[PDB]
Amino acid sequence: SGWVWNQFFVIEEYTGPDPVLVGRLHSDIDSGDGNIKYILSGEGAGTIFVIDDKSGNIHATKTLDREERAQYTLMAQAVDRDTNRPLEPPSEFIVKVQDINDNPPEFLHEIYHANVPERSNVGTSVIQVTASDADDPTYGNSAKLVYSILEGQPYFSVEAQTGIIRTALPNMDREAKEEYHVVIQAKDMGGHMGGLSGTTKVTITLTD
Amino acid sequence: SGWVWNQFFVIEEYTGPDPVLVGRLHSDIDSGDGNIKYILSGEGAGTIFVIDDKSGNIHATKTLDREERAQYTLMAQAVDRDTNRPLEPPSEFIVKVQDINDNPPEFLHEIYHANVPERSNVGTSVIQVTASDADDPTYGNSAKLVYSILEGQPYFSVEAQTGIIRTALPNMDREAKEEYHVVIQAKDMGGHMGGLSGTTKVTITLTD
Numbered sequence: 001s002g003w004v005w006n007q008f009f010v011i012e013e014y015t016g017p018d019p020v021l022v023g024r025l026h027s028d029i030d031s032g033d034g035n036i037k038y039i040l041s042g043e044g045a046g047t048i049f050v051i052d053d054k055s056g057n058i059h060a061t062k063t064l065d066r067e068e069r070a071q072y073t074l075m076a077q078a079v080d081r082d083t084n085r086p087l088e089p090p091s092e093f094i095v096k097v098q099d100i101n102d103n104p105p106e107f108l109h110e111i112y113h114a115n116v117p118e119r120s121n122v123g124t125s126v127i128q129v130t131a132s133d134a135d136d137p138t139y140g141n142s143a144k145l146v147y148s149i150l151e152g153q154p155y156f157s158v159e160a161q162t163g164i165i166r167t168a169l170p171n172m173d174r175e176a177k178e179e180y181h182v183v184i185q186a187k188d189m190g191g192h193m194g195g196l197s198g199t200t201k202v203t204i205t206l207t208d
Numbered sequence: 209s210g211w212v213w214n215q216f217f218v219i220e221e222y223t224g225p226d227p228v229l230v231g232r233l234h235s236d237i238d239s240g241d242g243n244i245k246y247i248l249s250g251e252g253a254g255t256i257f258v259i260d261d262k263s264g265n266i267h268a269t270k271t272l273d274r275e276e277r278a279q280y281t282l283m284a285q286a287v288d289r290d291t292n293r294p295l296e297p298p299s300e301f302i303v304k305v306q307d308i309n310d311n312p313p314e315f316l317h318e319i320y321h322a323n324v325p326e327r328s329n330v331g332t333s334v335i336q337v338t339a340s341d342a343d344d345p346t347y348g349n350s351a352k353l354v355y356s357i358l359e360g361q362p363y364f365s366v367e368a369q370t371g372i373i374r375t376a377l378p379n380m381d382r383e384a385k386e387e388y389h390v391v392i393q394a395k396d397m398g399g400h401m402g403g404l405s406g407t408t409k410v411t412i413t414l415t416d
C-alpha cells in the first residue's frame with residue numbers, strides 16, 4: 001500500500017545453464033498447501049516466461065537481449081484448484097530486462113574534418129564530436145559517456161561530457177603546422193575502471 | 209491487494225562485471241520528478257545491497273552464495289527530499305537468493321557393505337543408499353536426486369528415488385560368485401541433461 005512492488009527484473013544476456021527466476025506470483029491466502037493454481041497470461045507468457053502453477057515461480061526460458069525488448073507486461077491469475085473459482089482478481093505486472101553493458105560507444109563518423117582560425121584565443125571551439133552508445137541511457141550508465149583527448153594535446157582540449165574540442169594554446173600562428181591530427185576517445189560508465197570505449201580522429205585546418 | 213509482490217530474487221554466484229539489479233523501491237506518488245529520497249535499512253543494507261536514492265534501485269554489490277544465506281529482510285523508507293517528512297510508511301521486504309545448481313550430489317559413505325540371503329526372491333531389498341546434495345531441496349531441483357545402477361546388473365536393481373538396492377534375479381545360489389560389486393549413481397535435476405552427479409560402490413555378500 002502506497003509502495004509499488006509489482007514489477008520484476010531480469011539481467012539480460014544470461015547464458016548460465018540454469019533458468020533465471022524472474023519472480024513469483026503469490027497470494028496471501030496461500031497457506032502453501034497446494035490448493036491454489038497460478039496462471040500467467042500476456043507477452044512472452046508461455047514462450048519466454050513460464051510458471052510453476054503450485055509454487056507460482058516464473059522463470060526465463062531464453063537469454064534476453066535488453067536491446068531487443070526492455071519490457072513485458074504480464075497478467076497474473078490465481079484460481080482455487082478445487083472450486084476453480086478465482087482467489088485473486090487478475091492483475092498486471094511488468095518484467096523489465098535489466099541493462100548490461102554489452103555495447104561499446106561508437107562515434108557518428110570516425111573521421112571528422114574541422115577548421116578554426118589561426119590566432120584564435122585559447123578556449124575557442126573547433127567541433128562537437130559525439131558517440132552513440134547502444135545500451136540503456138535511461139537506467140544504467142553503460143551509456144554514460146566520457147570524452148578524453150588521446151592525441152592532439154597540448155594543442156587542443158575536449159570537454160569531458162559535451163565532447164566539444166576547443167583550441168588550448170595562445171598565439172597559434174599558422175606557418176607552424178599544416179593540418180593538426182587529433183584523436184578523441186569516448187568511454188562507457190562515466191569512464192570508470194571497466195567501461196567499454198571507442199575513438200575517432202578529427203583533422204583540423206587552421207584557417208588564415 | 210490480495211496478491212503479494214514485495215520480495216525480490218537474486219541469482220546466486222553471479223560473477224559478471226556489472227552489478228545485479230535486485231529490485232526497486234518506488235512510490236505511487238513519485239512522478240519521478242526527483243523530490244523523493246528512498247532509504248534502505250536492514251540486513252546487508254549498505255554492505256551487500258545498495259540503493260540509488262533518486263531511482264530507488266537496489267543492486268547487489270557482491271557475488272552471493274545461496275548456500276551461505278538464502279534471505280535478507282530489508283526495510284524501505286521514502287521521505288520527501290524538501291520537507292523531509294515521510295511519504296510512505298516504512299515497510300519490510302525480503303530478498304531471496306535464487307539457488308543455482310553448483311553442488312554435485314555426494315554419497316554418505318562411498319563404500320557401502322551390504323549382505324543378503326542366497327536364494328532370496330527377486331525384489332528382496334539389500335540396502336538403502338543415499339546422497340546428500342548441498343543445493344536447495346526447497347526451491348530448485350538442483351537437489352532432486354535420481355539413482356541409477358551403473359555396475360552390478362543384471363544381478364541387482366536400484367529404486368529410482370528411494371535409492372534402495374534390491375536383488376533382481378531368481379535362484380541366486382551362492383557357489384556362483386563370492387562377493388558382488390555394484391556401483392550406484394546419484395544425479396541432480398531429476399537426472400536430466402545437465403545434472404551434476406556422484407557415485408558409490410556397494411559390496412554385497414550373499415549369506416548362506
Ligand SMILES: [Ca+2]
Pocket residue numbers: 012013064065066067102
Ligand atoms: Ca544486449
Ligand SMILES: [Ca+2]
Pocket residue numbers: 012066067099100101102103134135136142
Ligand atoms: Ca545492454
Ligand SMILES: [Ca+2]
Pocket residue numbers: 101102103104105133134135142143188196
Ligand atoms: Ca555501452
Ligand SMILES: [Ca+2]
Pocket residue numbers: 220221272273274275310
Ligand atoms: Ca553456491
Ligand SMILES: [Ca+2]
Pocket residue numbers: 220274275307308309310311342343344350
Ligand atoms: Ca546452489
Ligand SMILES: [Ca+2]
Pocket residue numbers: 309310311312313341342343350351396404
Ligand atoms: Ca546439486
